[PDB]
Design a binder for these strands. Structure first.
Ligand SMILES: [Zn+2]
Length: 347
DNA sequence: AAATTGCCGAAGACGAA
DNA sequence: TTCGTCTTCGGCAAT
């Protein structure tokens, strides 16, 4: 359904005036919070790392959701893995961060307490209001003029080599270059405070994800000229639209609550590994390329396996995170959608 | 000492052709 | 389509 998908992608185009209005409203709130945190001893070198779909140029229909990471430069860090989770770690030191130590580990909850307290106090004096202190890692979520959501995620920045659990991840050697993978792994990795049970930190590579999407092609000139337009980003947009429309259509149910845009985003990266060549993502074959993303995502649902693109042994669809009935329900609707030329693209 | 700020240009929306 | 013009974003050199 290439003709319908292009129509869907056209209605999904963000308004140029809306992003200008949205970004300015986010900028005023974000610059205010950053300026305040830089005045505290604990968050001396806090910096802005814009992540998420908007800054990956894959935002879906309106610039109403902004993912923002307040990164913190951390030196001499010792990682101890929590059980065999491969993605959750205890943070030790090999400084203003000693106030957040519980013995030898870096207490997350102590750092979120001060991070949230400073942010909640600042915006109490502001049309923005706090919320979403559940889920651990996105420390806080803001709502600007009850219109735009801003997920603020506290993060540590470690410039050391990536943890051993990422050794066989980021399999981009045949898609991007092996030099690119070497260069990307020289960039820092990020630690965000996530519950697993307490005082743990999860690995975060949203900066690598953002850099890959803005440099998606195997060819360097991909999506720079009319002869090399690909549909990678458009397939991710449609994949995000399928999940969002289904989550909205079944909002009254609880089955689709666990599935996030990161799952679709992660599954998209694996399809790019399976289809490394740009000729496998031509504009004319938008239906085939989107069906590839739909088919692979279904295999992840049916096999209960969606590897983290950077941590292979971290199953995003394991039974501990999502029950089989929720994955079976989403599998049902995706095939019904595909069998009927995706009715949710109209409602 | 270390954080700040401006500069430059690609990405992609928009209108026209 | 294709184009130009437009605005936003991100890196770092300037201190
Ligand atoms: Zn491309």
């Amino acid at each position: 359904g290439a003709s319908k998908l292009r129509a869907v992608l056209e209605k999904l185009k963000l308004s140029r005036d809306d992003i200008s209005t949205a970004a300015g409203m986010v900028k005023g709130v974000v610059d205010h919070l950053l300026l305040r945190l830089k005045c505290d001893s604990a968050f001396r070198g806090v910096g802005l790392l814009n992540t998420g779909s908007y800054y990956e140029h894959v935002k879906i229909s309106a610039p109403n959701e902004f993912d923002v990471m307040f990164k913190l430069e951390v030196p001499r860090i010792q990682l101890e893995e929590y059980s065999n989770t491969r993605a959750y770690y205890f943070v030790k030191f090999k400084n203003p961060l000693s106030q957040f130590l519980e013995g030898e580990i870096l207490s997350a909850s102590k750092m979120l307490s001060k991070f949230r307290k400073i942010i909640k106090e600042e915006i109490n004096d502001i049309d923005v209001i706090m919320e979403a202190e559940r889920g651990g890692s996105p420390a806080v979520t803001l709502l600007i003029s009850e219109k735009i959501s801003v997920d603020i995620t506290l993060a540590l920045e470690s410039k050391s080599s990536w943890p051993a659990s990422t050794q066989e991840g980021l399999r981009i050697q045949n898609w991007l270059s092996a030099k690119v993978r070497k260069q990307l792994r020289l960039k820092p990795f990020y630690l965000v405070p996530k519950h697993a049970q307490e005082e743990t930190w999860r690995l975060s590579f949203s900066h690598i994800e953002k850099e890959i999407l803005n440099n998606h092609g195997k060819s360097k000139t991909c999506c720079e000229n009319k002869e090399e337009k690909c549909c990678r980003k458009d397939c991710l947009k449609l994949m995000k639209y399928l999940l969002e429309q289904l989550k909205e259509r079944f909002k009254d149910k609880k089955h689709l609550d666990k599935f996030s845009s990161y799952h679709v985003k992660t599954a998209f990266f694996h399809v790019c590994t399976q289809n490394p060549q740009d000729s496998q993502w031509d504009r004319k074959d938008l239906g085939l390329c989107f069906d590839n993303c739909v088919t692979y995502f279904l295999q992840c649902l049916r096999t209960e396996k969606l590897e983290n693109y950077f941590i292979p042994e971290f199953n995003l669809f394991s039974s501990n995170l999502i029950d089989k009935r929720s994955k079976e329900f989403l599998t049902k609707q995706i095939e019904y959608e595909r069998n009927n030329e995706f009715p949710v693209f109209d409602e």
